[PDB]
Structures are given as structure tokens and as C-alpha cells.
Amino acid sequence: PQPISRLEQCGINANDVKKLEEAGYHTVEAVAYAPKKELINIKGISEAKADKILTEAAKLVPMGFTTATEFHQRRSEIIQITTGSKELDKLLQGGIETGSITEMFGEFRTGKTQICHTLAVTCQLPIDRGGGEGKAMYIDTEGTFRPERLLAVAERYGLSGSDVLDNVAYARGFNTDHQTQLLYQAEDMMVESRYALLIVDSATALYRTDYSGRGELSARQMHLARFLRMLLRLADEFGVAVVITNQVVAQVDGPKKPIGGNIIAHASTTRLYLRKGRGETRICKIYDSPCLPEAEAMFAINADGVGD
Amino acid sequence: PQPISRLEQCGINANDVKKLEEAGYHTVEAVAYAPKKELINIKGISEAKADKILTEAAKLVPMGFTTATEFHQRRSEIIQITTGSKELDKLLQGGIETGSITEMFGEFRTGKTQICHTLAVTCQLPIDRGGGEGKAMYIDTEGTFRPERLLAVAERYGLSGSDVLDNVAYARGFNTDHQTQLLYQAEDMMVESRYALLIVDSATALYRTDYSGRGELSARQMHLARFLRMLLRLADEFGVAVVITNQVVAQVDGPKKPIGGNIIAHASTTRLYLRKGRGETRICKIYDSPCLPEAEAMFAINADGVGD
Amino acid sequence: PQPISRLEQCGINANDVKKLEEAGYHTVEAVAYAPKKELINIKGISEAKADKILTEAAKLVPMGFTTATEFHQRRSEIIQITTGSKELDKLLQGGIETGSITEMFGEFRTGKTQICHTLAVTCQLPIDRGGGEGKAMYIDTEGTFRPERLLAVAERYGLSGSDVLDNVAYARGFNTDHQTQLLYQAEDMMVESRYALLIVDSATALYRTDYSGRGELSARQMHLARFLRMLLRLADEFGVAVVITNQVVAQVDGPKKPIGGNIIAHASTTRLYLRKGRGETRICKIYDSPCLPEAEAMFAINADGVGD
DNA sequence: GTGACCTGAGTCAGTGAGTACGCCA
DNA sequence: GGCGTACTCACTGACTCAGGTCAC
Ligand SMILES: Nc1ncnc2c1ncn2[C@@H]1O[C@H](COP(=O)(O)OP(=O)(O)NP(=O)(O)O)[C@@H](O)[C@H]1O
Ligand SMILES: Nc1ncnc2c1ncn2[C@@H]1O[C@H](COP(=O)(O)OP(=O)(O)NP(=O)(O)O)[C@@H](O)[C@H]1O
Ligand SMILES: Nc1ncnc2c1ncn2[C@@H]1O[C@H](COP(=O)(O)OP(=O)(O)NP(=O)(O)O)[C@@H](O)[C@H]1O
Numbered sequence: 001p002q003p004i005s006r007l008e009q010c011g012i013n014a015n016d017v018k019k020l021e022e023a024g025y026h027t028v029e030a031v032a033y034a035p036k037k038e039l040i041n042i043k044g045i046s047e048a049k050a051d052k053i054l055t056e057a058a059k060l061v062p063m064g065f066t067t068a069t070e071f072h073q074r075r076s077e078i079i080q081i082t083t084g085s086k087e088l089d090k091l092l093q094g095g096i097e098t099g100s101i102t103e104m105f106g107e108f109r110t111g112k113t114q115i116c117h118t119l120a121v122t123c124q125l126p127i128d129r130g131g132g133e134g135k136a137m138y139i140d141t142e143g144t145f146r147p148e149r150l151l152a153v154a155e156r157y158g159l160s161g162s163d164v165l166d167n168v169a170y171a172r173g174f175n176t177d178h179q180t181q182l183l184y185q186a187e188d189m190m191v192e193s194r195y196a197l198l199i200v201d202s203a204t205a206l207y208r209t210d211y212s213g214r215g216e217l218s219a220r221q222m223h224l225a226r227f228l229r230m231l232l233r234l235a236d237e238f239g240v241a242v243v244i245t246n247q248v249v250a251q252v253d254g255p256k257k258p259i260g261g262n263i264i265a266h267a268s269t270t271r272l273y274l275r276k277g278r279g280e281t282r283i284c285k286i287y288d289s290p291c292l293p294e295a296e297a298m299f300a301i302n303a304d305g306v307g308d
Numbered sequence: 309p310q311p312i313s314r315l316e317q318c319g320i321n322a323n324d325v326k327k328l329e330e331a332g333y334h335t336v337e338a339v340a341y342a343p344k345k346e347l348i349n350i351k352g353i354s355e356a357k358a359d360k361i362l363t364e365a366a367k368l369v370p371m372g373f374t375t376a377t378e379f380h381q382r383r384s385e386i387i388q389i390t391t392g393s394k395e396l397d398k399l400l401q402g403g404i405e406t407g408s409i410t411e412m413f414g415e416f417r418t419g420k421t422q423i424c425h426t427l428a429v430t431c432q433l434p435i436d437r438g439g440g441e442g443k444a445m446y447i448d449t450e451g452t453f454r455p456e457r458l459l460a461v462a463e464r465y466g467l468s469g470s471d472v473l474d475n476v477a478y479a480r481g482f483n484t485d486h487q488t489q490l491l492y493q494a495e496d497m498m499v500e501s502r503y504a505l506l507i508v509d510s511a512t513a514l515y516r517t518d519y520s521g522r523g524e525l526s527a528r529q530m531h532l533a534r535f536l537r538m539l540l541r542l543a544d545e546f547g548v549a550v551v552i553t554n555q556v557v558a559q560v561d562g563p564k565k566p567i568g569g570n571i572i573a574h575a576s577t578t579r580l581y582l583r584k585g586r587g588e589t590r591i592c593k594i595y596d597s598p599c600l601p602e603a604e605a606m607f608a609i610n611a612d613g614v615g616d
Numbered sequence: 617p618q619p620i621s622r623l624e625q626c627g628i629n630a631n632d633v634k635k636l637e638e639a640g641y642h643t644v645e646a647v648a649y650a651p652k653k654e655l656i657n658i659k660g661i662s663e664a665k666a667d668k669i670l671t672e673a674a675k676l677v678p679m680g681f682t683t684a685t686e687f688h689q690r691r692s693e694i695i696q697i698t699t700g701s702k703e704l705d706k707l708l709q710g711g712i713e714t715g716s717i718t719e720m721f722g723e724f725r726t727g728k729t730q731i732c733h734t735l736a737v738t739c740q741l742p743i744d745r746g747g748g749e750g751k752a753m754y755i756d757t758e759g760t761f762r763p764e765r766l767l768a769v770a771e772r773y774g775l776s777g778s779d780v781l782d783n784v785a786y787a788r789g790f791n792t793d794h795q796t797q798l799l800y801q802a803e804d805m806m807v808e809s810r811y812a813l814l815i816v817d818s819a820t821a822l823y824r825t826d827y828s829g830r831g832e833l834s835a836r837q838m839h840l841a842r843f844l845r846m847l848l849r850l851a852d853e854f855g856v857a858v859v860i861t862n863q864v865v866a867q868v869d870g871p872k873k874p875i876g877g878n879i880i881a882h883a884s885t886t887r888l889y890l891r892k893g894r895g896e897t898r899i900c901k902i903y904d905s906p907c908l909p910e911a912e913a914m915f916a917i918n919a920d921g922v923g924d
Numbered sequence: 925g926t927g928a929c930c931t932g933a934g935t936c937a938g939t940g941a942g943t944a945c946g947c948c949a
Numbered sequence: 950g951g952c953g954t955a956c957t958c959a960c961t962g963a964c965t966c967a968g969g970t971c972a973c
């Protein structure tokens with residue numbers, strides 16, 4: 001957490017610091033991730049303070065050509081502890097690749113919210129369970145968040161108390177504004193919420209309800225792309241696992257197809273697939289990942305705890 | 309391959325040469341390549357100083373009319389870094405020419421970063437396997453550069469695990485402005501070396517999330533043109549391949565076209581479309597190349613690297 | 617044509633002829649075309665000197681009216697260069713005409729470079745079959761010169777060998793001032809030897825990438841007008857077939873119009889819109905030509921060249 | 925042979941750029 | 950297999966002539 005408040009000590013005007021904090025941006029990394037074009041439109045920042053803040057931000061962080069040795073060493077802060085029920089974290093080697101946009105693009109009845117609760121609990125798994133991690137956020141656009149499931153999966157992982165594992169943000173969207181403000185206040189600049197989980201339950205569901213037809217596609221997807229960029233910037237800020245879900249559409253043209261299309265196809269790092277099949281048990285895929293190979297898995301929910 | 313300070317050794321004022329060095333010109337070609345307008349825009353340079361700088365620059369480097377057979381004998385050595393797949397480096401004649409800019413685009417899960425990952429390693433190779441006898445300076449904006457592959461690459465090529473990572477230069481470049489900036493830092497830090505492959509993985513991932521909406525589109529494409537022209541400058545200046553990769557959007561008629569419009573369409577020399585095929589096997593196509601004919605590959609993304 | 621120092625040997629003092637030799641006036645036709653306002657601003661020459669050199673040049677070069685009947689005699693023996701395709705041949709009424717500016721624009725992968733490459737070899741074919749029997753100059757601005765593709769054309773028509781790469785002269789413009797300066801250097805290489813093609817592989821790519829905004833819009837259109845003026849001077853004093861190449865831009869208001877605006881739109885006698893057709897086969901439609909219809913035709917790019 | 929004085933009058937336009945964005949049984 | 954809508958960007962500079970009137 002290297003925020004705009006620590007930027008004050010660098011010699012930056014306090015008034016401009018607060019007038020940037022009142023905007024979306026909250027950290028030196030945030031402005032260093034935005035052009036001069038985005039800084040030019042903040043009222044009270046006029047074409048000179050923006051540039052000098054750009055130079056100060058560029059000098060403050062080592063945002064230059066490295067050799068990636070340090071990048072592999074930074075891989076150590078990143079843990080994939082998605083245990084689930086069976087064959088998670090073994091065949092699906094990367095369940096939570098912190099710093100990457102995991103995307104459970106799946107189907108109804110195939111346990112996307114259930115696995116989201118599992119993921120939220122596992123991101124709170126202590127150091128003894130293969131690494132201890134924090135928790136910062138949960139978006140509930142479709143209004144399906146039952147912390148009773150959190151308690152049930154807590155008992156699965158050996159957690160007696162689930163109120164400690166109660167996710168720090170039960171925010172909801174109600175519309176396409178993707179909960180603008182929480183990305184801004186919850187920039188996770190405190191001492192907690194480091195290597196946390198940022199769940200967006202049905203991130204682009206509301207983009208389907210509110211935004212409608214071809215007449216609103218451009219605005220819908222540009223809003224979506226700005227939102228996904230905000231997610232990616234949040235992930236780049238320290239390290240956080242951006243785990244989102246998504247629903248399928250039906251290809252009447254002549255069986256799942258992306259919703260959000262190529263914006264979410266390219267934005268998300270490790271995109272994922274879920275299937276029901278036969279019996280109670282359901283199948284997944286390992287689908288997109290620059291590191292993992294295509295494969296399938298095998299899992300089932302229980303009442304006293306859930307896998308995938 | 310002649311450092312800019314050598315013009316000072318000719319007799320040009322030391323203050324002028326250093327102020328040009330921090331002006332974005334780090335080779336005797338950098339000053340010669342640009343027009344007088346950019347040199348004039350530099351602080352401390354008048355019209356006369358710029359004119360004498362241009363004359364002394366044109367004195368050294370041959371800006372003349374060499375017959376096409378001279379260029380053909382220059383074309384005997386092209387290096388043509390191999391791809392790793394027998395069919396892929398057969399569709400490409402010998403590979404990809406060094407000294408021209410190549411672009412790879414496709415939908416998700418098409419192995420653009422896979423081709424980059426298994427084609428940058430093939431540059432720090434003896435020419436016996438179509439190597440380049442150079443290094444890499446992979447630049448990557450989305451963080452698709454997952455280090456697990458980055459250190460699981462080297463088991464097939466015949467090289468140790470130490471001298472693959474130690475021969476790449478990775479930064480992030482999480483801005484539209486940071487792309488050209490990183491190009492400048494790369495030029496000034498790699499003039500004193502012998503590189504064979506500069507990779508700009510996602511040239512246009514950052515020209516969507518950043519410059520949102522029309523009206524803001526023209527500045528987006530002007531910045532893209534600036535970046536692409538400086539990119540092309542690194543080809544004549546250092547004789548390297550500068551492979552970039554692209555993305556797609558749904559061309560809603562009311563399904564596959566590259567982003568960047570007609571600015572990335574023209575600057576690129578060779579354009580490769582990667583598409584998911586029947587099963588794990590991929591399909592590559594020659595979209596837009598000056599010498600290469602249109603044909604399809606069938607390369608398969610294997611664990612060691614792109615094979616067939 | 618006659619070189620600059622022809623009447624000077626018995627006329628003006630050789631010193632001022634060598635003084636104006638730096639100003640890029642390497643033929644007495646060029647001095648004839650010269651405005652007095654553009655000769656007062658060069659060093660050495662006074663009012664009386666400028667007037668006397670202009671009177672001498674006007675004595676050497678015809679300047680007034682001429683009955684269109686005799687100019688029809690000139691136009692009946694001009695040479696039209698074969699394009700390399702049989703169907704493009706009749707479409708362009710004998711192919712690319714000489715002594716005038718021709719401009720083919722289009723999106724990528726439309727074969728604009730490919731037609732120029734085949735034009736560079738068909739520049740040397742005999743008078744009974746090919747275009748002008750002369751050395752082909754290839755001022756190139758994108759680096760997409762492929763001598764290999766030149767050869768494949770040489771196998772056809774039975775002019776194989778590197779004897780076609782010796783005739784072709786290849787420059788490489790690196791900016792706008794230099795692309796303009798290269799026409800001063802190219803000015804003297806055509807008064808001493810026969811050249812029959814003035815391919816500027818992209819007339820406007822560097823204008824697009826050099827002058828950034830709207831503040832530079834008046835400047836760049838002025839400079840481009842000057843460049844097209846010297847192009848027209850070359851075309852109408854050497855009788856070379858200038859073949860410039862234009863890119864495209866996308867209309868956002870409502871769909872691909874060429875870049876350059878009302879300057880190059882008016883100042884490019886013949887315009888072609890090459891468009892991709894189906895498969896490997898592309899289409900060439902006429903856009904703006906004062907003497908041939910606005911139809912559209914067919915062609916394709918093979919491993920041999922741009923033929924059927 | 926001696927002996928300086930007095931400011932008026934405005935002008936004349938030019939240059940286009942730049943695509944995005946899936947949907948539904 | 951019948952489905953549309955979205956707008957903002959700016960800098961440019963060189964220019965000349967004209968005179969004529971007196972007494973102590
Ligand atoms: N506690 C449980 N025990 C066993 N099976 C369960 C349990 N909870 C849910 N399930 C099963 O898992 C499915 C959950 O599907 P899920 O995709 O999470 O629901 P949804 O309504 O599609 N939510 P979302 O996809 O986030 O919009 C249910 O339909 C049941 O078949
Ligand atoms: N070890 C491996 N063995 C086999 N296949 C692998 C292996 N690692 C990666 N792959 C495959 O390579 C594919 C390419 O990854 P991909 O999703 O294209 O990365 P990306 O190019 O960064 N994504 P995008 O930007 O959407 O193209 C994966 O989906 C796997 O199918
Ligand atoms: N040997 C060949 N055989 C057949 N077709 C070929 C061959 N070489 C190139 N082509 C075709 O020519 C196309 C390229 O045309 P080109 O003239 O390079 O377009 P351009 O618009 O000038 N390129 P850019 O630099 O992106 O503007 C390729 O996409 C192929 O379709």
C-alpha cells in the first residue's frame with residue numbers, strides 16, 4: 001500500500017492530493033497506471049500538476065525493465081489453495097492465481113455461487129492450511145449470498161467460527177453501475193486485505209438486465225471494459241485474486257457461449273468452464289490459462305461443506 | 309549500432325549531445341531518423357542547431373539509393389527466429405524476419421503469448437536451430453507473463469534454466485503513455501547490447517480500457533500511431549524482430565476482427581490469425597504478410613513449447 | 617530533360633549554379649518551374665540574378681500554351697506500365713500510367729505493396745510487353761521492401777536473375793523531411809540515367825505518424841502539399857510513373873475513407889480503392905480518375921505475383 | 925548672410941482525424 | 950434469425966513607402 005497520502009511526503013501539494021483522493025484514484029500506483037489524459041480531466045489538476053505527479057510517480061516505483069527473477073520471487077506471495085472437494089488444486093493446479101482474473105464462466109445449477117463461498121472461505125484459510133490469506137470484497141449483483149453456506153463450508157475446512165470468516169463486504173449492485181464507489185474506497189490500502197479475494201458474483205449479469213439490445217451494446221461493453229480495467233488495476237495493486245463468475249447464453253444459431261464477449265475473453269487471465277453432466281456430481285474444465293493445459297475435473301457438493 | 313555520443317566525438321557540442329540523449333535520441337540513427345520538427349521541439353535547440361545536427365547525422369549513416377541487389381545481399385542474413393514447430397516455421401518460410409514488425413491476433417485461448425513465449429527462447433539459440441544469438445526484452449501489459457511457464461520452458465531447447473531468464477528483459481507498461489516511454493528506455497538500455505527479439509505482447513489491450521468512447525478515439529489512435537512508428541524505428545536501428553500481439557471484438561452486423569482499427573492494420577508487416585481448432589490442436593493463418601503466401605498451420609501447444 | 621549546369625557553361629556564372637545546386641535544383645526544368653519567391657530566399661542569388669536565370673530557363677524550357685492536338689501527340693506515345701494482372705490491365709486502361717501521380721489506397725492485406733513489387737519488375741520489361749524498360753526507384757517508408765518477391769516476378773516474363781535487382785534503386789525514407797530530401801537526391805539520379813518508376817511505398821504513413829494533433833494539421837497538410845508538388849515536378853519533368861500509396865481512416869459519425877484530407881484527395885490524379893474480396897481473391901474499384909470509369913474489377917495474389 | 929517645419933496610413937485565411945461493441949432459447 | 954447506438958479534438962505571421970514651402 002503506497003497511497004496518495006504517502007505521496008504528500010514526496011513534496012506534492014496537499015490540496016491536489018485530496019482533490020485526487022476525492023476522485024476514483026487512491027494510490028501512487030493508480031495514477032501511475034493512468035495517462036496524462038485521465039489526469040487532465042480531474043478538476044483542480046491543470047496540465048502541470050498532472051505532469052509533475054506523473055514524474056513523481058514514475059520515479060517513486062521501479063516501473064522499468066527488470067529481468068523477471070524478482071517476478072518469480074514475487075510468485076512466492078501467491079498461493080493456490082483452492083482445495084474444494086476432490087481434484088481441485090491437483091489437476092486444476094491454479095485455483096486462485098493471485099494477480100490474475102479467474103473467471104468461472106459457468107452454467108446455472110453447476111455451483112458457481114457455492115464454489116464462490118468455498119473460495120471466499122479458502123482465501124481466509126490460515127497459515128497452517130498451506131498459507132494464510134486475507135479478504136477484502138464480495139459483490140452480490142444477482143442477490144445470492146447465503147453466509148449459511150459460508151458456515152457449512154467453514155466446518156468442511158476445519159473452521160469452527162464462520163463469523164471471523166464473514167466476508168468483509170456484502171455489497172450489491174442493483175444496476176449496471178457495477179458498484180462504482182467500492183472499487184474506490186476499498187482500494188485495500190489498510191494493513192489487512194493483503195493477498196485477498198475480490199469476488200464479483202455474476203459480474204456481467206446486470207449488464208444483461210439493465211443494458212438491453214444492440215442500442216446499448218457499445219455503452220454496456222465500454223462500461224464493462226472500464227470496470228474490468230479497474231479490476232485488473234486492483235489486482236496489479238499489491239496482489240489480489242480477482243475471482244469473478246458469469247453465466248452462459250444459448251447459441252440459437254446452431255453448448256455455452258461467452259456473455260460479455262471478447263472484452264471478458266481477453267481481459268480475464270484464467271477463464272474457466274462448468275458443466276453438470278450426469279448424477280449429482282459435476283464436471284469443470286481448466287480452459288484458458290497461459291500456464292495450465294486444458295483438462296477436466298470431478299467434484300460434488302455436500303450439505304456440511306461444499307467443493308465446486 | 310553506433311552510439312549517439314560518437315557524434316560528439318566528431319565535434320558536436322557535448323551539451324547538445326547529452327541534451328539530445330535525454331531528449332529521446334540514444335543512437336546516431338535516432339537523431340538522423342527523426343525530422344527537424346521534433347529536434348526543434350527539444351529545449352535548448354534552435355533552428356540552426358537542429359539543421360547542423362541533421363547535416364552531421366546524414367553525413368555518417370547512408371541515407372542513399374542502394375540498388376536492390378545490395379539490399380538483397382543485406383537480406384542474406386535475416387536470422388528468421390524459428391517458432392519451434394516444424395510446420396509453423398514452414399508456413400513462415402524460415403520463420404519471422406528480423407527488421408520488420410509482426411502481429412499475432414485471435415480469440416481467447418489461441419496461444420499468442422504461447423508463440424511469444426516459445427519464440428523468444430528460440431532467439432537465444434545458435435542459428436543451428438534458427439536462433440538469433442541475442443536476447444529478449446519481452447514487454448507485457450496484462451501480466452499474462454505467468455512465471456511458472458517462464459521457468460518451466462527450458463527442458464526441450466537444449467539450454468540450462470539459468471540462461472533463459474537471465475536473457476530476457478521484462479517490465480509491465482501499464483499505461484498507454486508507458487508504452488512509448490518503455491520503448492525509449494529499451495532503446496537507451498539495449499543500444500549497448502545485441503538483442504534479437506523485442507516482444508510487445510499486447511499493444512492494443514491498453515488502447516481500449518484507457519481511451520474509452522468515441523471523441524476520445526482520435527487521441528487513442530494518434531497515440532497508437534506514435535507508438536507504432538517508434539516501434540518500427542527500432543527495426544531499422546537495431547535489426548531485430550519486434551513481434552506484437554492483438555485482440556478481437558465482435559463486429560456486430562445486426563465475429564472476429566482485430567482491434568486497433570486501421571492504424572495497427574497498416575504498420576504491421578506480417579499478420580497471423582490464431583484460432584481454436586478441432587481439439588487441442590491450433591490453427592494459424594497468414595492474414596497480411598508481404599512475402600508469405602496465405603496458408604494454414606496446425607501447430608499444437610505442447611508443454612515444452614509450440615510443437616506440431 | 618537537361619541537367620542544371622547545361623546553359624551555365626555559356627550563360628550564368630558557374631559559382632551561383634553550384635550555389636543553387638544545394639537547393640535541390642539539379643535540372644534546368646526544375647529551375648524553370650521555380651518561383652521567384654522561392655529563389656529570393658536562397659543565399660547568393662539577387663533580384664537581377666534570379667530574373668536572368670529564370671529568363672534563361674524559360675528560354676530553354678517551353679512554358680506557354682500548346683494546342684491540345686499536339687499535346688495529344690505527346691499523350692498518344694506515353695507508356696502505361698503493366699500491372700501484373702490481366703484483369704487489372706483493362707480496368708486501369710493499360711495499367712499504371714506514366715508521367716502522372718497514381719495512388720492506390722486500401723485497408724491492409726489488399727496487395728498495395730504486392731502490386732508495387734510486381735510493378736518494380738514490370739518496370740524493366742521490353743517496350744512490346746512491359747512498362748518503360750527502365751530502372752525502377754523504390755523510395756520506401758515502411759520497410760516492406762521484399763527483394764525476394766521481386767525475384768518471383770522475374771521468373772515470370774522470362775527476366776529472371778539478379779539483373780533486375782541491379783536495375784532497381786532502393787531508397788528508405790525515415791521521416792517526412794528526409795522523404796522530401798530524398799527527392800533532391802533522387803532528382804540528380806534521373807537526369808543521368810533512365811528511371812521509369814517512382815514508387816513511394818507510402819506517401820502518407822510518416823505524415824500520419826509525425827504530425828500528431830490538430831495544431832499540426834495546418835502544418836502537415838502544407839508539407840504534404842509541398843511533397844506532392846515535388847512529386848508532380850518529378851512526374852512531369854522526368855516522365856516517371858509516380859505510384860504513391862495511401863492508407864485508410866474510419867468514419868465514426870455514422871465506411872473507410874483515405875487519410876490526407878482534401879489535399880491528397882485533390883492532388884492524386886488516379887485513385888484506386890483496393891478491397892479484399894473472397895478467399896485469396898481481392899477486388900479493385902476505381903475512386904477518382906479524370907479519364908476512366910468508376911467500375912470495379914477482380915484480381916488475386918499468388919506465389920508468382922498479383923495476377924489472376 | 926539669416927532662417928526649420930511638419931506624420932499619414934491596415935492587411936489577409938487555413939487545415940481533417942479517428943472505430944467499438946454480443947444476444948438469446 | 951431478428952436485434953443500433955455512441956463525438957470530441959487548435960494551432961498557425963509575416964508585410965513599407967510617401968516632400969516641398971520663402972522673404973527679409
Ligand atoms: N448445499 C448444497 N448441497 C448440495 N447441492 C447444492 C447445495 N447448494 C446448491 N447445490 C446445487 O448446486 C446448484 C447451484 O448452482 P449455482 O450455479 O451456484 O446457482 P445459480 O442460481 O445459477 N447462481 P449464479 O450462477 O451465481 O447466478 C443448485 O442448483 C443445486 O443443484
Ligand atoms: N503445459 C501445457 N500443455 C499443453 N497446453 C498448454 C500448456 N500450457 C498452456 N497450454 C495451452 O495453451 C493455451 C493458450 O493459452 P491462452 O489462453 O491463449 O493464453 P493468452 O494467449 O495469454 N490468452 P488470450 O489473450 O485470450 O489469447 C491454453 O489454453 C492451453 O490450452
Ligand atoms: N507469395 C504469396 N502468394 C500469395 N499471396 C501472397 C504472397 N505474399 C503475399 N501475399 C498476399 O499479399 C497480402 C499482402 O498484401 P500487402 O501489399 O502486403 O498489403 P499492405 O496493405 O500493403 N500491408 P501493411 O503493411 O499492413 O499495410 C497477403 O496478406 C497475402 O494475401
Ligand SMILES: [Mg+2]
Pocket residue numbers: 107108109110111112
Ligand atoms: Mg446455478
Ligand SMILES: [Mg+2]
Pocket residue numbers: 415416417418419420421422
Ligand atoms: Mg492466447
Ligand SMILES: [Mg+2]
Pocket residue numbers: 728729730760
Ligand atoms: Mg504495403
